[PDB]
DNA sequence: GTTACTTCACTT
DNA sequence: CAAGTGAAGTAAC
């Protein structure tokens, strides 16, 4: 009911995206994952509410991991290791669901490597 | 066969 | 307890 109000509430092509296996093709990636997702946040106030992803600054996001993991799809734990495997360094423990993250080359505006 | 995850049943 | 560990798996390429 809750992933159900989410993924209805995002864009066919985002709620795709997020679907779509993790191969070779760096858009299939977590990392691009996590910013498109970011990135169109950013234009939905609302929903970027109820999930619980946004940029605080240039470089860091602060999320609901919870959330984030449903909408993507994935375990929780899953979410976790993917953050710890790529890279992602954790600002913040949690509060009240929330923590707060950057990962270099990762911006509002940047995606880097792989 | 490779890759980039994904999951589980613990532990910390 | 939120987040990490180690062993095992999945499927597009
Ligand atoms: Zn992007
Ligand atoms: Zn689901
Ligand atoms: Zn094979
Ligand atoms: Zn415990
Ligand atoms: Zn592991
Ligand atoms: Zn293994
Ligand atoms: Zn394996």
């Known amino acids: 009911d809750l ?4 993924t209805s ?3 066919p092509e985002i709620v795709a995206a ?3 296996k993790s191969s070779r093709d760096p858009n299939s990636r977590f990392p691009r994952k996590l910013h498109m997702l970011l990135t169109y946040l950013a234009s939905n106030p ?4 109820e999930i619980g992803l946004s940029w605080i600054s240039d470089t860091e996001f602060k999320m609901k991991k919870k959330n984030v993991a449903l909408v993507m799809g994935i375990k929780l ?3 976790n290791v993917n953050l710890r495997d790529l890279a992602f360094e954790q600002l913040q423990h949690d509060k009240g669901g929330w923590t707060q993250w950057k990962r270099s080359g990762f911006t509002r505006n940047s995606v880097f490597e792989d």
């Open 46 to 49: 609302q929903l970027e509410e």
């Open 77 to 79: 734990n899953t979410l």
């Open 9 to 11: 509430r995002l864009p």
């Open 18 to 20: 997020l679907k779509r």
């Open 3 to 6: 992933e159900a109000s989410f």
